Design an enzyme around this catalytic site. Structure first.
Site, short mmCIF file in Angstrom:
data_model
loop_
_atom_site.label_atom_id
_atom_site.label_comp_id
_atom_site.label_asym_id
_atom_site.label_seq_id
_atom_site.Cartn_x
_atom_site.Cartn_y
_atom_site.Cartn_z
N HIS A 1 0.82 -1.22 0.06
CA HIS A 1 -0.02 -0.15 -0.04
C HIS A 1 0.83 1.24 -0.11
CE1 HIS A 1 0.23 -0.09 4.60
NE2 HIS A 1 0.41 1.21 4.12
N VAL B 1 16.34 16.28 10.35
CA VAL B 1 17.61 16.95 10.48
C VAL B 1 18.77 15.98 9.63
CG1 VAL B 1 19.53 17.53 12.25
CG2 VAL B 1 16.98 17.93 12.66
N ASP C 1 0.57 1.01 20.62
CA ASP C 1 0.45 0.55 19.14
C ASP C 1 1.11 1.26 17.87
OD1 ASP C 1 -1.00 -1.00 16.81
OD2 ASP C 1 -2.97 0.12 17.16
N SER D 1 3.26 2.70 8.74
CA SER D 1 2.99 1.56 7.87
C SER D 1 4.34 1.29 6.74
CB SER D 1 1.81 1.66 7.13
OG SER D 1 1.75 2.63 6.08
N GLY D 2 4.68 0.18 6.58
CA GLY D 2 5.64 -0.42 5.81
C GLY D 2 6.67 -0.78 6.58
N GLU E 1 18.93 7.24 9.07
CA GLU E 1 18.31 8.60 9.66
C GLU E 1 17.86 7.95 11.20
OE1 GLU E 1 17.08 11.43 8.35
OE2 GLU E 1 16.69 11.13 6.37
N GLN F 1 -0.56 5.95 12.19
CA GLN F 1 -0.31 6.72 10.82
C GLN F 1 0.97 7.27 10.92
OE1 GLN F 1 -3.58 9.85 10.65
NE2 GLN F 1 -3.69 8.85 8.76
N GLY F 2 1.74 6.71 9.67
CA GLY F 2 3.17 7.02 9.17
C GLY F 2 4.15 6.06 9.86
N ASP G 1 -0.16 -7.57 1.42
CA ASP G 1 0.59 -6.27 1.57
C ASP G 1 1.95 -6.24 1.75
OD1 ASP G 1 0.52 -3.48 1.63
OD2 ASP G 1 -0.43 -3.50 3.62
C1 LIG Z 1 0.17 7.89 6.61
N1 LIG Z 1 0.13 6.68 6.45
C2 LIG Z 1 -0.97 5.97 7.07
O1 LIG Z 1 -1.90 6.64 7.54
C3 LIG Z 1 -0.79 4.65 6.67
C4 LIG Z 1 -1.82 4.04 5.73
C5 LIG Z 1 -2.31 2.68 6.04
N2 LIG Z 1 -3.42 2.23 5.38
C6 LIG Z 1 -4.06 0.99 5.83
C7 LIG Z 1 -5.52 0.46 5.40
C8 LIG Z 1 -5.56 0.56 3.93
C9 LIG Z 1 -4.49 1.33 3.21
N3 LIG Z 1 -4.48 1.53 1.91
C10 LIG Z 1 -5.53 0.93 1.16
N4 LIG Z 1 -6.39 0.37 1.99
C11 LIG Z 1 -6.68 0.22 3.00
O2 LIG Z 1 -7.63 -0.40 3.85
C12 LIG Z 1 -8.50 -1.13 3.23
C13 LIG Z 1 -9.22 -2.30 4.02
C14 LIG Z 1 -8.53 -3.18 4.44
C15 LIG Z 1 -8.57 -4.03 5.64
C16 LIG Z 1 -7.13 -3.14 5.40
C17 LIG Z 1 -3.29 2.00 4.02
C18 LIG Z 1 -2.26 2.67 7.45
N5 LIG Z 1 -1.40 3.67 7.82
C19 LIG Z 1 -0.53 3.52 8.98
O3 LIG Z 1 0.53 4.14 9.14
C20 LIG Z 1 -1.18 2.84 10.03
C21 LIG Z 1 -0.27 1.78 10.94
C22 LIG Z 1 -0.44 1.31 11.76
C23 LIG Z 1 -1.73 1.31 12.21
C24 LIG Z 1 -2.17 0.24 13.44
N6 LIG Z 1 -2.96 1.10 14.59
C25 LIG Z 1 -2.59 1.81 11.51
O4 LIG Z 1 -4.05 2.03 12.15
C26 LIG Z 1 -5.08 2.78 11.60
C27 LIG Z 1 -2.51 2.74 10.60
CA LIG Z 2 18.75 11.91 10.44
#
Ligand SMILES: CNC(=O)[C@@H]1C[C@H](N2CCc3c(ncnc3OCCC3CC3)C2)CN1C(=O)c1ccc(CN)c(OC)c1
Ligand SMILES: [Ca+2]
Length: 223
Positions: free
Chosen positions: A40, A57, A171, A177-178, A52, A174-175, A84
């Site tokens: 994703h 910085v 937990d 992921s990956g 990093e 946002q940010g 994913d």
């Molecule tokens: C700025 N980056 C972000 O916001 C990313 C995008 C990512 N999302 C996931 C669902 C999804 C995506 N892309 C297409 N479809 C998606 O979902 C479709 C539904 C399928 C069942 C997942 C991409 C969630 N993000 C996280 O960093 C994140 C990490 C850990 C957690 C655990 N607390 C979390 O929890 C809400 C969020």
């Molecule tokens: Ca750095």
């Protein structure tokens, strides 16, 4: 990362930041010229940032290398996040050193109760938003598949696992992921999705890397 701690500079040397003018996803360095991240996170114009700590910085140990090729898993489904995972080949090899280092792939799947290290530059608040700039870390256990499926009925596949704390408070967010989930020196997970952050009965969901090791190795060897 919500409820975690400041890692310390370059203490997670396999952690990468994917940058397209700004940090948008984490990733994990798996050899000098390849990074693992979430499918994703796919987009054009990726620069991989290695070494990093504070992403705002330049501290002196960074390597910035553009992606040359991205390979999203052949079975990735963007609607459900099944499979994913994606590979990114760098335009040039990173220079491997104490601050820029690869992480081993699993040789087998890890179990419920295994303790892992989750890291990233994501939001640190469970309500509202604050971004830390320095890398954050969280120690968390893998949860049983039955508690994962019960927390997320109809949404957990054989390619996912939950990790964290059903009581809430700790937990990924946002940010993040990956990015990596590392257990006993192996990259067992990739930060994938969830419902909110650090809420009761809504743990993080992670791509189950052990199911992809054969594909990763074959893909790297042929590209
Ligand atoms: C700025 N980056 C972000 O916001 C990313 C995008 C990512 N999302 C996931 C669902 C999804 C995506 N892309 C297409 N479809 C998606 O979902 C479709 C539904 C399928 C069942 C997942 C991409 C969630 N993000 C996280 O960093 C994140 C990490 C850990 C957690 C655990 N607390 C979390 O929890 C809400 C969020
Ligand atoms: Ca750095």
């Amino acid at each position: 990362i919500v409820g975690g701690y400041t890692c310390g500079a370059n203490t997670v040397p396999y952690q990468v930041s994917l940058n397209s003018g700004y940090h948008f996803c984490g990733g994990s360095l798996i050899n000098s010229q390849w990074v693992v991240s979430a499918a994703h996170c796919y987009k054009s114009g990726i620069q991989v940032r290695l070494g990093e700590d504070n992403i705002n910085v330049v501290e002196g140990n960074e390597q910035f290398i553009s992606a040359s090729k991205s390979i999203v898993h052949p079975s990735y489904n963007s609607n459900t996040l099944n499979n994913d995972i994606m590979l990114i080949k760098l335009k040039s090899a990173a220079s491997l050193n104490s601050r820029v280092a690869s992480i081993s792939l699993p040789t087998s799947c890890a179990s419920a109760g295994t303790q892992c290290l989750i890291s990233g530059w994501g939001n640190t608040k469970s309500s509202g938003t604050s971004y830390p700039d320095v890398l954050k870390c969280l120690k968390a256990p893998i949860l049983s598949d039955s508690s994962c499926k019960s927390a997320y009925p109809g949404q957990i596949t054989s390619n996912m696992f939950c990790a964290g704390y059903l009581e809430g408070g700790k937990d990924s967010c946002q940010g993040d992921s990956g990015g990596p989930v590392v257990c006993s020196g192996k990259l067992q997970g990739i930060v994938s999705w969830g419902s909110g952050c650090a809420q009761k009965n809504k743990p993080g969901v992670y791509t189950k890397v052990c199911n992809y090791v054969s594909w990763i190795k074959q893909t790297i060897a042929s590209n």
